[PDB]
């Protein structure tokens, strides 16, 4: 089919710094998983704090997606911000699904407040994402670090604030196309 199939990987920050704004991260994902969820699309739900976890493996089944959203709702944000581990679990599923032979999109929800080695590990891991043929988007939360999100996303054009709401979602939907 001329219609391009898309694999969407949500890499969600569940650290302590976003604990009071976790509803904003869930709302964005819940809105995106229904407003722009055409057939032949597949989604994955990944969260990260001090450890990364695949809450929803890559699937297009509407039932498992719905149950993945229910699991995101019960998430208790706490811990460090190891976004490279979250990106790494997306890269593992991308390579498994076919790597360069897939059309994979990574959407990271975070405040970009990284510490220690995570800035370099996150930038390196995102380059692995781009080497696998994936397009990386960064959706900033709270008073997010714009410069940090630009060094992770493909460009400043792929960095958007979550406060933009439906307009920001639409901008990301039009950007994916
Ligand atoms: Cl934190
Ligand atoms: Mg954080």
Curated annotation (Swiss-Prot):
The lineage of its organism: Eukaryota, Metazoa, Chordata, Craniata, Vertebrata. Belongs to the ATR family. Expressed in prostate, thymus, ovary, testis, pancreas, colon, heart, kidney, lung, liver, peripheral blood leukocytes, placenta, skeletal muscle, small intestine and spleen. Residues 1-177 are extracellular. The chain holds residues 38 to 214 of 489 of the full protein. Changing residue 8 to P: In HFS; infantile form. The gene is ANTXR2. It is linked to Hyaline fibromatosis syndrome: An autosomal recessive syndrome characterized by abnormal growth of hyalinized fibrous tissue usually affecting subcutaneous regions on the scalp, ears, neck, face, hands, and feet. The lesions appear as pearly papules or fleshy nodules. Additional features include gingival hypertrophy, progressive joint contractures resulting in severe limitation of mobility, osteopenia, and osteoporosis. Disease severity is variable. Some individuals manifest symptoms in infancy and have additional visceral or systemic involvement. Binds laminin, and possibly also collagen type IV. It comes from the Eukaryota. A divalent metal cation binds at residues 15, 17, 81. The modification Phosphothreonine is found at residue 110. This is Anthrax toxin receptor 2. Necessary for cellular interactions with laminin and the extracellular matrix. Residues 7-176 form the VWFA domain. Coiled coil: none annotated.
């Amino acid at each position: 089919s001329a219609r391009r199939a898309f694999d969407l990987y949500f890499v969600l920050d569940k650290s302590g710094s976003v604990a009071n704004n976790w509803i904003e991260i869930y709302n964005f994902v819940q809105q995106l998983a229904e407003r722009f969820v055409s057939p032949e699309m597949r989604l994955s739900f990944i969260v990260f704090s001090s450890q990364a976890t695949i809450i929803l493996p890559l699937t297009g089944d509407r039932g498992k997606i719905s149950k993945g959203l229910e699991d995101l709702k019960r998430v208790s944000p706490v811990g460090e911000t190891y976004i490279h581990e979250g990106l790494k679990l997306a890269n593992e599923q991308i390579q498994k699904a076919g790597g360069l032979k897939t059309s994979s999109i990574i959407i990271a929800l975070t405040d970009g407040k990284l510490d220690g080695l995570v800035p370099s590990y996150a930038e390196k891991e995102a380059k692995i994402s781009r080497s696998l043929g994936a397009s990386v988007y960064a959706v900033g939360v709270l008073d997010f670090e714009q410069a940090q999100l630009e060094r992770i996303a493909d460009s400043k054009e792929q960095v958007f604030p979550v406060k933009g709401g439906f307009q920001a979602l639409k901008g990301i939907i039009n950007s994916i196309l």
